[model samples]
Target chain A: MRKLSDELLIESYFKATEMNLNRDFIELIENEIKRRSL
Target chain B: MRKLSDELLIESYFKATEMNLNRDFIELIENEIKRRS
Candidate 1:
């Protein structure tokens, strides 16, 4: 998998909601992002 | 906001799936976590 920068990752996290996917996974990703920001 | 360690952030990313929310946000969060890692 290609490595992404922190800024890119944050952008991706916000964009994830735009794609079609399971809600659980989405929440997981959000939590992960928030955790890091914390 | 509490500062989280890389390890904890990773764990939250995996656990997020357990909660109920939009998938897009999850992906975004996952991407950010992966980015940091």
Candidate 2:
């Protein structure tokens, strides 16, 4: 994994959400966000 | 499957988080948060 950036992480989360992608796809980004949260 | 509650949802998120569960486990709660969000 390429150590995904937070800026891109949050953006991608929101974007993937707005686009209404599948739960699995959104979960990938959400997991990263939670990783940062901790 | 039962519809997980947000009260428990958030609590579970923080709880599972403090306990430091695996990525897959944490992902379940995080996915729900995104779902509720």
Candidate 3:
């Protein structure tokens, strides 16, 4: 089983967004991680 | 004192940066806010 979860990355993304980040870039990174994991 | 200070915005920017946001984008927003205030 994978110890790391997508939830952690999603949570990190939200935290960054709440702090006013470039959402597009955050999404880009998040998606890349998901792609790599798959 | 200004009820809403620029520090609030700057602090928010820092928090975002700490969360690993693009510094360039954050700077863009910060400069916009500063320009308005």
Candidate that scores best on TM-score: 2
True contacts kept of each: 0.00, 0.00, 0.09
Using lDDT as the yardstick, the better of models 1 and 2 is 2
Interface RMSD in angstroms for candidate 3: 3.8
In model 2, where do residues sit more than 4 Å from their true spots?
B1-37
What lDDT tens digits, residue by residue, belong to model 3 across residues B1-37?
A: 2353676666666675677778887777567676767
* Candidate 1 chain A: worst-modelled 10 consecutive residues by lDDT: A12-21
* Per-residue lDDT of model 1, residues B1-37, tens digit only: 0366776565556556656467986787777776765
The CA lDDT of each predicted structure is 0.63, 0.72, 0.65
Write out the backbone clash pairs for model 2.
none
Fnat of candidate 3 is: 0.09
What local lDDT does model 3 show for residue A5? 66
If ranked by DockQ, best first, what sequence of candidates would result? Answer: 3, 1, 2
The candidate scoring highest on lDDT is 2
lDDT of 2 by residue, A1-38 (tens): 13877787787777666545688989988877887788
Winner on TM-score between 2 and 3 is 2
Residue pairs clashing in model 3 are: none
Global CA lDDT computed for model 1? 0.63
When just chain B is superposed on the true chain B, each candidate scores a TM-score of: 0.50, 0.79, 0.47
Cα RMSD (angstroms) for every candidate in the order listed: 15.5, 12.7, 10.1
What are the runs in model 3 whose C-alpha is more than 4 Å off? A1-4, A33-38, B1-37
